Structures are given as structure tokens and as C-alpha cells.
Curated annotation (Swiss-Prot), chain A:
Native organism taxonomy: Eukaryota, Fungi, Dikarya, Ascomycota, Saccharomycotina
Gene behind this protein: RPN10
The record's account of how the chain is modified after translation: Ubiquitinated, leading to its degradation. Ubiquitination is promoted by HUL5.
Keyword presence, NAD: no
Superkingdom as given in the UniProt entry: Eukaryota
Summary of the function given for this chain in its UniProt record: Multiubiquitin binding protein.
Gene Ontology MF terms: K48-linked polyubiquitin modification-dependent protein binding; polyubiquitin modification-dependent protein binding
Organism: Saccharomyces cerevisiae (strain ATCC 204508 / S288c) (Baker's yeast)
Keyword Ubl conjugation in annotation: yes
Residue span(s) of domain VWFA: 5-190
Other known facts: Present with 17200 molecules/cell in log phase SD medium.
Keywords recorded for this protein, A-Z: Proteasome, Ubl conjugation
Protein's UniProt name: 26S proteasome regulatory subunit RPN10
Phenotype of the disrupted gene, per the record: Cells are viable.
Any GO BP: ubiquitin-dependent protein catabolic process
Swiss-Prot record, chain B:
Protein name in UniProt: 26S proteasome regulatory subunit RPN9
Family of this protein: Belongs to the proteasome subunit S11 family.
Protein's UniProt keywords contain DNA repair: no
Domain of life (superkingdom): Eukaryota
PANTHER family from the UniProt entry: 26S PROTEASOME NON-ATPASE REGULATORY SUBUNIT 13 (PTHR10539:SF0)
Pfam annotation, one family: PCI
Organism: Saccharomyces cerevisiae (strain ATCC 204508 / S288c) (Baker's yeast)
Gene Ontology biological process terms, A to Z: proteasome assembly; proteasome-mediated ubiquitin-dependent protein catabolic process; ubiquitin-dependent protein catabolic process
From Swiss-Prot, chain C:
Annotated localization: Cytoplasm; Nucleus
UniProt-recorded name of the protein: 26S proteasome regulatory subunit 6A
Protein function: The 26S proteasome is involved in the ATP-dependent degradation of ubiquitinated proteins. The regulatory (or ATPase) complex confers ATP dependency and substrate specificity to the 26S complex.
Residues of the full protein shown: 1 to 38 of 434
Modified residues (N-acetylalanine): 2
Family statement drawn from the similarity comment of this UniProt entry: Belongs to the AAA ATPase family.
Domain of life the protein comes from: Eukaryota
Modification after translation (UniProt): N-acetylated by NAT1.
Curated annotation (Swiss-Prot), chain D:
Residues of the full protein shown: 5 to 169 of 338
Protein's recorded name: 26S proteasome regulatory subunit RPN8
Domain MPN: 4-137
Source taxon at top rank: Eukaryota
Something else known: Present with 19800 molecules/cell in log phase SD medium.
Coiled-coil regions listed in the entry: none
Length: 197, 376, 38, 156
């Protein structure tokens, strides 16, 4: 399926501090990713992902490019759990990240947790979405927000990224209750179904 | 306010999934205490707002989900309040008793992070007026604790200084303390939202401890920093400010007029002002009057130019590091001080000018020589 | 009653990590162990 | 404090990096610096271009991998044990706060607070085209003065 690089954007933040489903949202985010990546790396081996900090007050990559269990290895340690959005920046790097994605013909993909209230400007958001689309990035977002984070940038954004869907963007805005994220997203063409473009 | 009750519903469902921050017992007890806007500190993001100073009796009900504090609201999260906010329950006891609850023991944050609780619990004992000996010992261990740590919180120091301030606040040594709190201000400087009664009174007590410093003068200080208006203003802050004037003016009865008990409680400022008037006059004399390699200042009229007199010159001037400061010595006969430094200052405005002059001067007259030497 | 099942079934991959992570760590020196020594 | 040796060998290739990378004022060619950092004098043995991306259109936005260093140090180790990470360089000539972030990456990778290195890729003014920094705190970072060693091998 997928031959592309991907990004894991994690907010460990106002929501991931705050467990969305067991054990905590942050933790809940976790195994879903291994779930995600498993499939992603099952989509094809060599489907590569990043992992960054959109969390805390410090943006940065967590897991750099690889396949690869090293991510699962890299994700091994924590984050600021109550931390805050780097997205615009963090995303922006994910672009630069993906720009450097090793052995391109791998398309640029991004997977993004929303544990934050999502502070950004539509313009920047769209310029990103543009820049993504400009860079031709795949972006599928994980959002369980207050409200959720939606009727907002995120909803616009996926669109604002999107001329063709997985060549640009898909979305799933994560649901509350007995919603296992990996169970949640199993449906959404964030994963499975059609996997890349 | 339901803002608790709200969150005592909402953040119970805020991710935080229908939590102990919504329990049949739970929402009642506030409503039981009040809906009336004065409350028990409301369980996460709003208790994270709420210090709420009706003494939390969700004392217990914050202490719910503290089981799940692993997978429930997790941070420091705790002495964020309680051990802070209920540290302000203000008994001996109280905190001692929830020392006796936590004692910085609880599952992971402290007894499996809780160092800042180690700060608190220990520090918090200290703010209870605990015996000096007992304090300092483990305080210095608390210090020793503090020592080898790389702690991203100032809060630790911001505990500890405030703590160790409080320690010296139990004490004199505002030379330390004031400075310690001065330190602590600089320790609070980046962080730590507070209250004014906190702010001024401390910064008062600080500014007090400046005079209960007094010092290596000072003169000028953190006054620049937002302790002022804020503190001064009024009451002794008037004085305290006018003492900054005294830190310049050095007129006894621009102050010894002012004096009420609290200041005259330590009369030695009358001395310290003599120390001031000397030192105050001194610094600029040292700073300015000679510029031309300032030293001599020797002695008497020059020293009485402090408008503190020759026979006190015979002491205050005579005392040097017997002032704590002056270097050099005395030619008594010729009535001449020998002097040297240990006169620093924070000021500006002056040798700025004088600076580059000589520094251009040789520089210029270099080029005369500096013309052909290697050139020719 | 089935939660700790999932929960510790969720730990297992995070558990699996460390050893697996180390199995990565292993080979690394194992060579430089051998390599040099060899 | 620990104020440090400088390896010209570094300095040279460092600009080659800058050169090789065709880094410009828009950019700073960044990389490892090597030595052993214990003593109140630290040594720079060597240093390694970290293939990198820098964006100051958004300050914190920039790209780098550590895993160079990962494989690097291995070989470095295999090359020499004494490589032990002292810190890192960049071009410069000047700092940009994202450095701080970047600085802290190496904190994982270094014994002490690691060592920044500025270079003047144009070597413009004076003694050093260079600054080396260690973070601090109200943050701190600082330049301790540094200089060359022998390296007469160099000197020859």
C-alpha cells in the first residue's frame, strides 16, 4: 500500500495530560500509533514515519526518520503530559522533515494528535496546508479535542490541504467514550482502506 | 460558582472521563460547602485555576483520583495547591498533618518531581516556625537536596529561597535574607504568579530586610525591579522609599523625623545612616570626584565633605573594612587616607564620557609614533 | 475485569520495546565486541 | 570553568562543511564537535557535519537527525574512544535561540551540558572566527574562551 514517509505529530498536552481513554490520552495515543505504524509498516515495509513534539512548550522531533520499531523504541519515553501546541511550527518542521524523507518517491505523510486546544491562524494553517499541498504532503489528523478541535482550522485544514485526499489530506476527529483510538482510526482512511497517495 | 461543580462535572468528563471529579458524594460537598464562589479548589484545570481558599475539604476529594494520579490528573499537580493552597490553611498541624498524610509519601510523584514536594513538605515544616536547629540541619540538607539537582523549576528554589528566606525571615541576616529573598525575587523573577499582600508585604519585608540588611550599601537596588509600586507607595514604604532617599540623601532628620518604633526598633540605622552618609558620599567621591585615577580622598575636609565630621572621620572614615569596605590606609599627619577599591556600583552616565578620551588619547598619540615604526 | 488484560496487553508492546529495543542495542556492541576483539 | 581546546582540523573542515553544504548567511552548517569534555579544560579533537536543515522564517523550524551521530560515534568510537562527545558546532557567525533547543538535543548525547560552537565562516574580524557556548540560566549560555593545541602534526 503506502510507499511514503509519514510524520507522527503528538500533542502531549491539555488533553493528553488528561486521559481520553485508557490508560491516559497520551498513553492512549501510544499503542494506537504502534497499531498505526504496524499497519503503516505493514502497508509497506519501508513506509517511514517521523515523531515530533507538538507537545510541551518545546517543539522538536522525537523519533526521526526510520522504518521502524526504533520509533516504538523512540516513543519509549514520556513527554510533557500537560504541555502545549507546537503544531504550526511542529507541523512546519514535519514538512521540512518530510522534505528530507529518505528515499523519496515515498510521499510526504503526516499523522497528528490533537491534545491541545489548537491555537493557530487560519492563514498560517492554510499556508501550511498549502505548503503541505505545495510540498504535496499527506496529512491525516488525530483530534480528540475540547468540543473537539474542529469547526476550526483542522476541518478547514484537511480541506485546505486537499486537492486529492491522501495525496494531500484526510481527517478523523477522535471521538469520546469507549473510543479506542486505534479502534477509532481503524475505520478512517487515516489507515487501512486506501492508504497513500 | 459551579466552576468547580461545572468541572466537578465537566473535567470529570474532560478527557478525564467521568472521574472522581464527578462523584455523587463529590459535587455535593462543594455545594454542601457552597456554590457561593468560595470553595475547596476544584479538581484540575480549574482547580489549576482554583486555589480556592475556603479551606479545601475536597482536601479529601482532590485526594480522590490521587489513587489514579498515575493515570489520572498527573503532574506535580498536587503541591500545585493544597500542599500549597492548604499550606495556607495556616495551622501548625494542617499541612504538618497532611505532611502526616503525604509526608512527601504517596505512590509515584513523591514515594516512587516530589522533590519539589520534598521541597515543600520539608520547606513547609519550616514556614511553621519550626526550631532553627531542626530547620537548618535538614534545611541545609534541603539545601543539600537542592544542591546537586538540575531542577527546571525555579519552583524548587522558588520554594527553597522563599523557604530559606522564611528561614532567615525567622531571623536576621537580611544581608543574607533580604538578598536571599532578593535572590528569591530573582528566583520568582521569571515565574510564580502571586498576590499583592504576598507581593508588597514580602517585598516590604524584603525592603524592610534591606534595612535589616544595611548592608554592603545599597544605595540603589532592586528598587528598580518591580518591587516598588507594588510596595512604595506608602506607610513605611514611604519611609522605605524615603530610605532610598536616605540611601542617597542621608539626612538623619529627613528620616529620624520619620522614625517610628519599627525602624527605631533597630536604632542602628542612625549609625547605618552615618555609615550611609559616609558611604553614600563616599561612593560618588570614589566614583567621580577625582576621576583622574580616583583614590586619595584624604582626609578630613574631603572626608568631612561627607558632611559627617572629622572625629567621625576618625572612625567611620577611619574604619575601612572596619566599614566592611575601604581599602588603603592613613597618613594621619598629612591628614591623608590611602585608599583602594571594594567600591562597586550599578550606576551609569558618567565615565562613559571620560572613558574613550584617554582611551582615544594615547590612541591618537599612538599614531604619531604609530605612524612609521613598522611602517618605516 | 478484562481491563488489566488490555492494559497489560498494552504494556506488552511497550514492554516488548525494551528487550526489542535492546535486541537492537545488543548487536551494536556485539560486533564491536567481536569486531575489535576478533 | 572547563574552557576548551580548539582543533584547527575541525575549523578547516568545518568551513568545508559550510563550503560543502554551500551554507550561506541564511543558513548555518551545523555539526558535532569531538574531544573529551571532563577537565576544566576541554579538548576539541574533531567534529562532524550534521546534515541538517535550518529555517528562520520560523525560528524553531529546522531539521536535523541525531542518528548520524549514532552511527557516527560508533565509527568514531571504533576510530577512537577519545571522541567522547564534547558538544557540537554550527556555522554561525551568531546564535539563534533555536540553538537552545538544538543545544539540548546534545545534552542527551553529551556528558556535561554539551558545547555549542560558533564559527565565522567568513573568519572576518579577528582572533577566532569562532565562539563556543554552553547553555545556562533567565536562561544562561556562555562563551568560555578557547584556543588551539599541538597538534604540531597540524602545526607542521
Amino acid at each position: 500500500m503506502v510507499l511514503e514517509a509519514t510524520v507522527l505529530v503528538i500533542d502531549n498536552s491539555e488533553y493528553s495530560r488528561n486521559g481520553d481513554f485508557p490508560r491516559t490520552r497520551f498513553e492512549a495515543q501510544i499503542d494506537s500509533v504502534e497499531f498505526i505504524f504496524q499497519a503503516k509498516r505493514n502497508s509497506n515495509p519501508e513506509n517511514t514515519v517521523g515523531l515530533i513534539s507538538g507537545a510541551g512548550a518545546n517543539p522538536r522531533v522525537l523519533s526521526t526518520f526510520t522504518a521502524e520499531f526504533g520509533k516504538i523504541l523512540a516513543g519509549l519515553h514520556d513527554t510533557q503530559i500537560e504541555g502545549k501546541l507546537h503544531m504550526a511550527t511542529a507541523l512546519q518542521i514535519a514538512q521540512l522533515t518530510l522534505k528530507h524523507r529518505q528515499n523519496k518517491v515515498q510521499h510526504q505523510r503526516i499523522v497528528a494528535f490533537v491534545c491541545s486546544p489548537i491555537s493557530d491562524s487560519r492563514d498560517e494553517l492554510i499556508r501550511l496546508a498549502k505548503t503541505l499541498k505545495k510540498n504535496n504532503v499527506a496529512v491525516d489528523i488525530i483530534n480528540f479535542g475540547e468540543i473537539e478541535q474542529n469547526t476550526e482550522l483542522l476541518d478547514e485544514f484537511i480541506a485546505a490541504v486537499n486537492n486529492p485526499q491522501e495525496e494531500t489530506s484526510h481527517l478523523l476527529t477522535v471521538t469520546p467514550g469507549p473510543r479506542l483510538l486505534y479502534e477509532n482510526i481503524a475505520s478512517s482512511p487515516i489507515i487501512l482502506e486506501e492508504g497513500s497517495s | 460558582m459551579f466552576n468547580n461543580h461545572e468541572i466537578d462535572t465537566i473535567l470529570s468528563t474532560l478527557r478525564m472521563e467521568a472521574d472522581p471529579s464527578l462523584h455523587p458524594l463529590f459535587e455535593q460537598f462543594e455545594k454542601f460547602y457552597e456554590e457561593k464562589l468560595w470553595f475547596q479548589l476544584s479538581e484540575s484545570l480549574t482547580k489549576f485555576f482554583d486555589d480556592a481558599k475556603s479551606t479545601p475539604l475536597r482536601l479529601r476529594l482532590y485526594d480522590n483520583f490521587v489513587s489514579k494520579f498515575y493515570d489520572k490528573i498527573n503532574q506535580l499537580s498536587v503541591v500545585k495547591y493544597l500542599l500549597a493552597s492548604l499550606k495556607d490553611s495556616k495551622d501548625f498541624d494542617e499541612s504538618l498533618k497532611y505532611l502526616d498524610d503525604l509526608k512527601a509519601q504517596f505512590q509515584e510523584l513523591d514515594s516512587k518531581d516530589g522533590i519539589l514536594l520534598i521541597d515543600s513538605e520539608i520547606a513547609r515544616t519550616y514556614l511553621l516556625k519550626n526550631d532553627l536547629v531542626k530547620a537548618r540541619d535538614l534545611l541545609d540538607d534541603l539545601e543539600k537536596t537542592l544542591d546537586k539537582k538540575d531542577s527546571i523549576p525555579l519552583r524548587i528554589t522558588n520554594s527553597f529561597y522563599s523557604t530559606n528566606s522564611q528561614y532567615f525571615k525567622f531571623k536576621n541576616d537580611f544581608n543574607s535574607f533580604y538578598y536571599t529573598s532578593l535572590l528569591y525575587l530573582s528566583t520568582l523573577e521569571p515565574s510564580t504568579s502571586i498576590t499583592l499582600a504576598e507581593r508588597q508585604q514580602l517585598a516590604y519585608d524584603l525592603s524592610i530586610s534591606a534595612l535589616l540588611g544595611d548592608k554592603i550599601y545599597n544605595f540603589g537596588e532592586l528598587l528598580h525591579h518591580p518591587i516598588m509600586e507594588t510596595i512604595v507607595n506608602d506607610s513605611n514604604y514611604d519611609w522605605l522609599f524615603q530610605l532610598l532617599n536616605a540611601l542617597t540623601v542621608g539626612d538623619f532628620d529627613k528620616f529620624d523625623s520619620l522614625i517610628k518604633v519599627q525602624i527605631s526598633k533597630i536604632p542602628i540605622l542612625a549609625q547605618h545612616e552615618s555609615f550611609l552618609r559616609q558611604k553614600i558620599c563616599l561612593m560618588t567621591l570614589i566614583e567621580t570626584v577625582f576621576v583622574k585615577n580616583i583614590r586619595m580622598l584624604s582626609f578630613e575636609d574631603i572626608s568631612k565633605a561627607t558632611h559627617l565630621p572629622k572625629d567621625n572621620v576618625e572612625h567611620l572614615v577611619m574604619r575601612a573594612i572596619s566599614l566592611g569596605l575601604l581599602k588603603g590606609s592613613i597618613d594621619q599627619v598629612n591628614e591623608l587616607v590611602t585608599i583602594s577599591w571594594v567600591q562597586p556600583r550599578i550606576i551609569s552616565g558618567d565615565q562613559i564620557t571620560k572613558m574613550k578620551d584617554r582611551l582615544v588619547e594615547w590612541n591618537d598619540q599612538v599614531e604619531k609614533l604609530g605612524k612609521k615604526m613598522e611602517a618605516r | 475485569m478484562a481491563t488489566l488484560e488490555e492494559l497489560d496487553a498494552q504494556t506488552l508492546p511497550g514492554d516488548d520495546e525494551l528487550d526489542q529495543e535492546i535486541l537492537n542495542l545488543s548487536t551494536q556492541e556485539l560486533q564491536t565486541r567481536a569486531k575489535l576483539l576478533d | 570553568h572547563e574552557k576548551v581546546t580548539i582543533a584547527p582540523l575541525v575549523l578547516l573542515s568545518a568551513l568545508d562543511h559550510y563550503e560543502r553544504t554551500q551554507t550561506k548567511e541564511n543558513k548555518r552548517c551545523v555539526g558535532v564537535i569531538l574531544g573529551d569534555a571532563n577537565s576544566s579544560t576541554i579538548r576539541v579533537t574533531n567534529s562532524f557535519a550534521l546534515p541538517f536543515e535550518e529555517d528562520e522564517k520560523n525560528s524553531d523550524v529546522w531539521f536535523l537527525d541525531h542518528n548520524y551521530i549514532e552511527n557516527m560515534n560508533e565509527m568514531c568510537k571504533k576510530i577512537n574512544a577519545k571522541e567522547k562527545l564534547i558538544g557540537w558546532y554550527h556555522s554561525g557567525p551568531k546564535l539563534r535561540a533555536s540553538d537552545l533547543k538544538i543545544n539540548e538535543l546534545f545534552k542527551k548525547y553529551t556528558q556535561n551540558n554539551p558545547l555549542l560552537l560558533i564559527v565565522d565562516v567568513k573568519q572576518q574580524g579577528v582572533g577566532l572566527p569562532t565562539d563556543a557556548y554552553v547553555a545556562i540560566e533567565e536562561k544562561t549560555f556562555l562563551h568560555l574562551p578557547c584556543t588551539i593545541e599541538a597538534e604540531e602534526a597540524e602545526e607542521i
